[PDB]
């Protein structure tokens, strides 16, 4: 199955902007490893064979890294190309543009920013595929991760209320969790054709979406759409798009999350020091480092000299040639 | 020719030599000054020479090992259409080029031993051993953070010399009495000792306090590693940890006829045994192989210790 993925880099570039002036956001190190590599490893796991990276801020340095990267080699699982367009792209703008090129072939993966995950999207695809095989008006299935409502990795954006048909796993209601919004307002018509629904405030909205080839054209149409959740999903539900259905894949294992905020960057990074996203762990040395795991979650590369009477405590990662 | 005088001679000549090697050098410089030229004459020789050597030094095990290695090298290339003389020069020629490897064996040991010490561990050693020191020092240069308990090793008092040796390399040290070794085992991560000789079953012949450490180590579930060069392997099989040739009469009692208070905190250094009494105590003990975790040699770390037997098997045919 020829699969492709679209990575919207440069998206949350403004949040980290004392940084992202020298480097770009996707080249920022999480745990001594550039964020873009986590995304690539995840897509490679998903079985993606074609990657397009929308970027602008330092798009030269980005394209350079990708050129000199692990993924430009003959062994690389996919083929990564880059797209340079005018900065501050919305998700809709990239998708509308994506349509003008007829780049999209079949079903594809749409992620914004950088994704740190070890969820095998293989089964999510076959689910999405066979669902389209029977009915082609199913255009997107959203990968979300089970959690608890107050969960630490569940932030402002990930905090959303979903209502899913318990048997068809079709999303019949979505609403982001804003303050001052004290209610969940559903249109009573849903209840006479979906009848065991599940209201869920425990999900982590990873915004890892598996979209169909219709979606770019559906963004050329309805040219007012900017955010993949705020406008598009709302549109399908409130029927701006008339006959479209979207689904949820609530993953119950592994890890998914996106590096969007400065605080999420902190959150995910220590979720990485903990072995939550294995094998994507410092001591796996994917970029040929020399890390080693020790008790109380301390990670040390080689050639690191420690003074005596020095106290390195738990959850600490030390790069090579570092002296204390 | 006073071979004995010679053997002692090297011993003072060079602190880093081993008793077996010193015996090998002994036989070599006898084989230099040896007029010989009869295999009967040629091989009558040392045997009275190592015999004379064996009878000339009181505790003779280690030099016997170096001996045993020498003659087996002799007869095995005197077998083989063996001419005498070519081995006579070749031994005298490469005598300097013997205490080469012997020194290279110890360094090979240290390069194998030092990774056994890892960051933040506490080592326990009994008395002074060049091999143990070599391992500890080699680890120290690699900037490894560790500390070492050293047993005051009576009667030899080797604990002081080893403590100072390790102090010079900026290694944190602490001395313990022979009676307090058991109390320290919970703080010990690894025990490391040397050995004058290693018997057929892979057992250790060493200083008198060695086996007690191996006993405490087994009881405290702590690894016990021995450090010895390959040429300390000797073919002799003690049937107990008490079965060794005694230099002097030992552990015998008084014969009194009608012959005519201390607290535990009190420290009386003037209340020790005299040397007349100490000469009634053993100089060495034997440590069974079941107390030895691994035996670090230049041949590598021997854990089987049916393997020390394997090597002695190869040595003899």
Curated annotation (Swiss-Prot), chain A:
The modification Phosphothreonine is found at residue 157. It is found in: Cytoplasm, Cytosol. It comes from the Eukaryota. Component of the translation initiation factor 2B (eIF2B) complex which is a heterodecamer of two sets of five different subunits: alpha, beta, gamma, delta and epsilon. Subunits alpha, beta and delta comprise a regulatory subcomplex and subunits epsilon and gamma comprise a catalytic subcomplex. Within the complex, the hexameric regulatory complex resides at the center, with the two heterodimeric catalytic subcomplexes bound on opposite sides. Acts as a component of the translation initiation factor 2B (eIF2B) complex, which catalyzes the exchange of GDP for GTP on the eukaryotic initiation factor 2 (eIF2) complex gamma subunit. Its guanine nucleotide exchange factor activity is repressed when bound to eIF2 complex phosphorylated on the alpha subunit, thereby limiting the amount of methionyl-initiator methionine tRNA available to the ribosome and consequently global translation is repressed. Belongs to the eIF-2B gamma/epsilon subunits family. This is Translation initiation factor eIF2B subunit epsilon. It comes from Schizosaccharomyces pombe (strain 972 / ATCC 24843) (Fission yeast). The chain holds residues 16 to 339 of 678 of the full protein.
UniProtKB/Swiss-Prot annotation, chain B:
GO terms for biological process: cytoplasmic translational initiation; negative regulation of TORC1 signaling; translational initiation. One of its GO terms (cellular component) is eukaryotic translation initiation factor 2B complex. It comes from the Eukaryota. SUPFAM superfamilies: NagB/RpiA/CoA transferase-like. It is found in: Cytoplasm, Cytosol. Changing residue 41 to K: Increases guanyl-nucleotide exchange factor activity on eIF2. Acts as a component of the translation initiation factor 2B (eIF2B) complex, which catalyzes the exchange of GDP for GTP on the eukaryotic initiation factor 2 (eIF2) complex gamma subunit. Its guanine nucleotide exchange factor activity is repressed when bound to eIF2 complex phosphorylated on the alpha subunit, thereby limiting the amount of methionyl-initiator methionine tRNA available to the ribosome and consequently global translation is repressed. This is Translation initiation factor eIF2B subunit alpha. The gene is gcn3.
